[PDB]
Amino acid sequence: GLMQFTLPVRLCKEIELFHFDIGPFENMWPGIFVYMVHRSCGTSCFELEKLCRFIMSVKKNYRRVPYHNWKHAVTVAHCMYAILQNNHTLFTDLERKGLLIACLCHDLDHRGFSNSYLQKFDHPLAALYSTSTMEQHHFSQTVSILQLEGHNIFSTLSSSEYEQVLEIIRKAIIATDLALYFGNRKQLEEMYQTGSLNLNNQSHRDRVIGLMMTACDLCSVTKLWPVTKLTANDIYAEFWAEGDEMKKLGIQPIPMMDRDKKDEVPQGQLGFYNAVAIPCYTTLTQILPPTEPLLKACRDNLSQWEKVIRGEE
Ligand SMILES: COc1ccc2c(=O)n(C)c3c(C)nc(-c4ccccc4Cl)n3c2c1
Ligand SMILES: [Mg+2]
Ligand SMILES: [Zn+2]
């Protein structure tokens, strides 16, 4: 129990900041996650033997795709760590335990293709899960890894606490289905503005947790410009692979997914920042004021994309 993880001084300081980049050294990512669990949750939340075995089985079940990979998993968990650390007293012990694990697991076994491509392909998962196809798969994969011998990091919870944390993780993971974010955010916007938002109302907490999951999931738009810009290439490498597979089914893909229409990328990012990211971090900042640095970083990156269009880069 007296074994802390400790990071080098530069990481020890920068990890606390929303805009931290976890770096190109893969073998440090498990250590970074465990550090974040210890500071966010406690050195007791989990038996280190089981947590380490859980982390390595999760890593194994992320594939070698350009964006939806183990690095995304750890990045999204770090943004959740930054939110939880800046909002100390607003979250239960069970929520802090659940949300870091949900973030690490949220895209388990992703192949780099959207729910739409699975449906048009007629992939068997599209028959098993009619909506939120990949997200219901990611939750299924999370439960499977939890049930491997030696992997049940929640085994020391009471029966009811166990049902509650698995229910936090399921809603958290389903909420990363971007098609569900638009309605979730409108509802939170109305509740905030009419004054009826109530964090002791579980249905409202669920909604606020869903928005946090979206905010963490999108956190590549909230880094320093060079990280944001170089991550956008990984994102587009999957989009264009999906675009190619669409053309193989005899369907012209949307221009965002068409590698012939790379010119339209900067305008595509404008649309995405204005339609999705800016509104997401605005409502989040309204509900949880200390998450303002994510909105400020996102606006900065919006401005960097405007500069790309004006030929200034
Ligand atoms: C409608 O789906 C889009 C379109 C464009 C983007 C995009 O441009 N960015 C930056 C993005 C970022 C940073 N995470 C995502 C994303 C979120 C959930 C699921 C899959 C992805 Cl890929 N997206 C996007 C998603
Ligand atoms: Mg996902
Ligand atoms: Zn994701």
- Please name which of 221, 313, 238 lies closest in space to residue 274, comparing C-alpha atoms: 221
Q: Which atom of ligand 1 is nearest to 269's Cα?
A: 8
Could you give phi then psi for residue 85, rounded to 5 degrees? Answer: -65, -30
Amino acid at the residue 282: T
CA-to-CA dists, residue 126 to 38, 114, 181, 185, angstroms? 38, 11, 20, 26
Quote the tokens at residue 230. 């170089």
Q: Is residue 294 part of a domain?
A: yes
In a domain, 22, yes or no: no
What is the distance between the alpha carbons of residues 302 and 307, in angstroms, rounded to a whole number? Answer: 9
Q: Which two tokens stand for residue 135?
A: 């997200």
Considering 19, 38, 68, 138, which one is annotated as catalytic? Answer: 68
The contacts of residue 191 (CB under 8 Å, 6+ apart) are 197, 204, 207
Has 106 been labeled as part of a binding site? Answer: yes
Domain-embedded: residue 188: yes
Q: Give the Å distances, CA to CA, from 196 to 199, 256, 262.
A: 10, 38, 44
Question: What are the structure tokens assigned to 45, written together?
Answer: 């939340």
Q: Which CATH number belongs to the domain containing residue 145 in this structure?
A: 1.10.1300.10
Any domain includes 17: no
Place of tokens 């001084």: 9
**Would you state the structure tokens that stand for residue 310, as one six-digit string?**
């004006």
Residue 94 lies in a domain: yes
* 68 in catalytic set: yes
And the tokens for 159? Answer: 């029966």
Annotated binding residue 107: yes
- Structural determination approach: X-ray
Ligand at shortest distance from the CA of 179: 1
Q: Which value, in Å, is the radius of gyration of the alpha carbons in the chain?
A: 19
> DSSP secondary structure string, the chain?
--------HHHHHHTTSTT----S-GGGHHHHHHHHHHHHT-SSSS-HHHHHHHHHHHHHTS---SSSSHHHHHHHHHHHHHHHHHTGGGS-HHHHHHHHHHHHHTTTT--S--HHHHHHHT-HHHHH-SSSHHHHHHHHHHHHHHTSTT--TTTTS-HHHHHHHHHHHHHHHHHT-HHHHHHHHHHHHHHHHHT---TTSHHHHHHHHHHHHHHHHTGGGGS-HHHHHHHHHHHHHHHHHHHHHHHHTT-PPPGGG-GGGGGGHHHHHHHHIIIIIHHHHHHHHHHSGGGHHHHHHHHHHHHHHHHHHTT--
In ligand 1, the atom with minimum distance to the C-alpha of 176 is 18
Q: 214 CA distance to ligand 3 centroid (A)? A: 9
Q: Give the chain's domain count.
A: 1
Q: How far is the CA of 114 from the centre of ligand 3 (A)?
A: 11
Range of the domain at 139: 28-310
The closest alpha carbon to 69, from 223, 222, 235, 216, belongs to 235
What is the spatial distance between Cα 283 and Cα 118, in angstroms, rounded to a whole number? 31
254 lines ligand 1 (CB under 6 A): no
Nearest CA to ligand 1 atom 15: 218
Q: Is residue 145 in some structural domain?
A: yes
Q: Within a domain: residue 15?
A: no
Residue nearest ligand 1's atom 2 by CA: 178
Q: Within a domain: residue 224?
A: yes
- Header resolution in angstroms: 2.1
